[PDB]
Design a protein around this motif. Structure first.
Motif, PDB file in Angstrom:
ATOM      1  N   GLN A 185      12.650  28.301   6.418  1.00  0.00           N
ATOM      2  CA  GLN A 185      11.453  27.818   7.138  1.00  0.00           C
ATOM      3  C   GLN A 185      11.765  27.622   8.617  1.00  0.00           C
ATOM      4  O   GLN A 185      10.906  27.117   9.330  1.00  0.00           O
ATOM      5  N   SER A 186      12.963  27.981   9.045  1.00  0.00           N
ATOM      6  CA  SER A 186      13.271  27.920  10.485  1.00  0.00           C
ATOM      7  C   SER A 186      12.416  28.941  11.193  1.00  0.00           C
ATOM      8  O   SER A 186      12.447  30.106  10.814  1.00  0.00           O
ATOM      9  N   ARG A 187      11.739  28.500  12.235  1.00  0.00           N
ATOM     10  CA  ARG A 187      10.934  29.435  13.021  1.00  0.00           C
ATOM     11  C   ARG A 187      11.903  30.073  13.990  1.00  0.00           C
ATOM     12  O   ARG A 187      11.662  31.208  14.378  1.00  0.00           O
ATOM     13  N   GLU A 188      12.968  29.363  14.345  1.00  0.00           N
ATOM     14  CA  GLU A 188      13.865  29.900  15.353  1.00  0.00           C
ATOM     15  C   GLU A 188      14.743  30.981  14.767  1.00  0.00           C
ATOM     16  O   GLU A 188      15.074  31.952  15.469  1.00  0.00           O
ATOM     17  N   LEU A 189      15.059  30.865  13.469  1.00  0.00           N
ATOM     18  CA  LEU A 189      15.790  31.933  12.798  1.00  0.00           C
ATOM     19  C   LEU A 189      14.911  33.151  12.595  1.00  0.00           C
ATOM     20  O   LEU A 189      15.273  34.265  12.996  1.00  0.00           O
ATOM     21  N   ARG A 190      13.702  32.938  12.077  1.00  0.00           N
ATOM     22  CA  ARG A 190      12.814  34.062  11.826  1.00  0.00           C
ATOM     23  C   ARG A 190      12.465  34.813  13.111  1.00  0.00           C
ATOM     24  O   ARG A 190      12.171  36.015  13.062  1.00  0.00           O
ATOM     25  N   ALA A 191      12.570  34.153  14.268  1.00  0.00           N
ATOM     26  CA  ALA A 191      12.303  34.827  15.533  1.00  0.00           C
ATOM     27  C   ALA A 191      13.363  35.863  15.883  1.00  0.00           C
ATOM     28  O   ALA A 191      13.096  36.749  16.707  1.00  0.00           O
ATOM     29  N   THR A 192      14.554  35.771  15.294  1.00  0.00           N
ATOM     30  CA  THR A 192      15.609  36.725  15.593  1.00  0.00           C
ATOM     31  C   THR A 192      15.552  37.975  14.724  1.00  0.00           C
ATOM     32  O   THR A 192      16.420  38.840  14.866  1.00  0.00           O
ATOM     33  N   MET A 193      14.565  38.091  13.834  1.00  0.00           N
ATOM     34  CA  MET A 193      14.545  39.099  12.786  1.00  0.00           C
ATOM     35  C   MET A 193      13.213  39.801  12.746  1.00  0.00           C
ATOM     36  O   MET A 193      12.241  39.391  13.387  1.00  0.00           O
ATOM     37  N   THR A 194      13.190  40.834  11.913  1.00  0.00           N
ATOM     38  CA  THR A 194      12.008  41.560  11.493  1.00  0.00           C
ATOM     39  C   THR A 194      11.413  40.859  10.273  1.00  0.00           C
ATOM     40  O   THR A 194      12.069  40.045   9.625  1.00  0.00           O
ATOM     41  N   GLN A 195      10.176  41.211   9.919  1.00  0.00           N
ATOM     42  CA  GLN A 195       9.612  40.621   8.715  1.00  0.00           C
ATOM     43  C   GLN A 195      10.308  41.185   7.500  1.00  0.00           C
ATOM     44  O   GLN A 195      10.510  40.470   6.505  1.00  0.00           O
ATOM     45  N   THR A 196      10.765  42.439   7.604  1.00  0.00           N
ATOM     46  CA  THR A 196      11.505  43.048   6.506  1.00  0.00           C
ATOM     47  C   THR A 196      12.906  42.464   6.390  1.00  0.00           C
ATOM     48  O   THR A 196      13.356  42.143   5.278  1.00  0.00           O
ATOM     49  N   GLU A 197      13.596  42.280   7.526  1.00  0.00           N
ATOM     50  CA  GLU A 197      14.921  41.658   7.503  1.00  0.00           C
ATOM     51  C   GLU A 197      14.858  40.268   6.869  1.00  0.00           C
ATOM     52  O   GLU A 197      15.735  39.882   6.083  1.00  0.00           O
TER      53      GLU A 197
END
Length: 455
Positions: free
Chosen positions: A70-82
């Motif tokens: 649920q980290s928004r900061e982690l998900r910002a470093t990735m693709t939706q597929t990654e």
């Protein structure tokens, strides 16, 4: 009664052969603690250990879901597929675990002494643990995803460092949390086995306990199969595309029944290694499947030109003896195609660069030969317990959870070839990750356990 402990660092007492059920207030108040057998005590302790452990695990799952998925900061470093692959269906795994925990908690609450937990075990193993299979099946993808992200994405690394420094993680890395459902589920058949051991005094309940052991073992096996099928299938399609059979009798590569055993480049030897040079050394890439060895020359990182092949039924391998009395060829061995792609015989003399490569090649090439050796006399084999969990990096290696009991079949150059106690799975893994079991009490009990878990 519920003070958190991360499952990553807990080792159940139910696996071998600081809060307890004996110390529980309601038991210390029912006073049934003197009027009960020494055995019904240990049975109640086992049921309680399944509930305590499942609690620690569910807690550790929710830490994983709130700090990193649920980290928004982690998900910002990735693709939706990654992101999809890195976290898989962990939400569905967690939801399953909690419905499981709630049924177990109910029983403990209703009676000071639980009648049985066997029905919940079997029910959930048959009708609600499917997300475990899916999670276990996509480990290949998450590891792959976690790797490139770790290798090629600096924002990922930084944000990850920062999430890991947070307190709820306990300094433990994200990977320690992702592998938690595999660790948990592979321990479940062992705990249900302990429950079976402590339900022998009773005839009707031992019935349900054995029922549930069968169901949970089928579930873990279904997980193992999902994982194998995923990797093996994509490997066969990828290799079918990459291998060029243009210049040999065509061999169709795709089977439901085929998979890779080992692959790697090796250096080619002449009969006379005496004028050998250590520069511009000729090479040979090998793809050994479970029924066929394929000899290729690597033209591209993604194109291999086939030169020969042979069913493994018709392949022999021998380590080569150093030349008689100057510096000669490192780690040689010989491969005999008895019946190759053109019906002839053939010899290939190769050099690997480590004692362990040669060992792994010769072990792989005798995959068909060695079948009896592992099964005939299992109690004789050294046992070892894995300290750190290991994810497999090659076709011959093995993926190991923490505390897995491994019978050792070979040992060379920092690498162990072993057979896992629980499923019989086999492969290589580095010595660093395991410690030798020395007590004959343990070894013996663990072998008895092996046979009773096996069908």
């Amino acid at each position: 009664k519920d003070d958190p402990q991360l499952y990553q660092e807990i080792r159940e007492r139910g696996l071998n052969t600081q809060l307890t059920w004996s110390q529980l207030p309601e038991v210390l108040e029912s006073g049934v603690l003197d009027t009960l057998s020494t055995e019904e005590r240990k049975r109640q302790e086992a049921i309680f250990e399944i509930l305590t452990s499942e609690f620690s695990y569910l807690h550790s799952l929710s830490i994983l879901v709130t700090e990193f998925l649920q980290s928004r900061e982690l998900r910002a470093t990735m693709t939706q597929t990654e992101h999809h692959h890195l976290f898989s269906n962990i939400l569905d795994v967690m939801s399953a675990s909690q419905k499981f925990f709630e049924a177990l908690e109910q029983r403990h609450k209703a009676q000071v002494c639980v009648e049985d937990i066997s029905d919940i075990l079997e029910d959930h193993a048959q009708h609600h643990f499917h997300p475990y299979i899916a999670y276990c099946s996509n480990e290949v993808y998450q590891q792959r995803t976690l790797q490139k992200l770790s290798n090629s994405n600096a924002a990922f690394r930084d944000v990850l460092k920062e999430i890991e420094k947070r307190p709820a993680c306990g300094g433990l890395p994200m990977i320690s949390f992702l592998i938690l459902p595999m660790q948990r589920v592979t321990r479940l058949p062992l705990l249900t086995d302990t429950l079976c051991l402590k339900t022998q005094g009773h005839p009707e309940r031992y019935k349900a306990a054995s029922q549930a052991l069968k169901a949970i073992s089928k579930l873990v096996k279904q997980c193992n199969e999902g994982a194998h099928k995923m990797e093996r299938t994509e490997q066969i399609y990828t290799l079918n595309m990459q291998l060029d059979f243009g210049k040999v009798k065509s061999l169709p590569l795709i089977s439901a029944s085929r998979w890779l055993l080992k692959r790697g480049e090796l250096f080619l030897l002449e009969e006379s290694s005496i004028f050998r040079k250590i520069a511009s050394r000729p090479t040979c890439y090998l793809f050994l499947f479970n029924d066929v060895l394929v000899v290729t020359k690597k033209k591209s990182e993604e194109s291999y030109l086939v030169q020969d092949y042979a069913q493994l039924d018709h392949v022999q391998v021998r380590k080569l003896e150093p030349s008689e009395p100057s510096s000669s060829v490192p780690y040689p061995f010989q491969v005999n195609l008895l019946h190759n792609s053109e019906g002839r015989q053939e010899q290939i003399l190769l050099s690997s660069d480590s004692a362990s490569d040669r060992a792994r090649w010769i072990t792989a090439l005798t995959y068909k030969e060695r079948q009896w050796q592992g099964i005939t006399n299992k109690g004789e084999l050294p046992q070892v317990e894995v300290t750190k969990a290991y994810f497999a990096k090659q076709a011959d290696e093995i993926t190991l959870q923490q505390a897995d009991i491994v019978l050792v079949l070979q040992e060379e150059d920092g690498w162990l070839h072993g057979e896992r106690l629980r499923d019989g799975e086999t492969g290589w893994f580095p010595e660093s990750f395991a410690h030798s079991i020395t007590s004959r009490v343990a070894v013996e009990g663990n072998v008895r356990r092996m046979e009773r878990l096996r069908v």
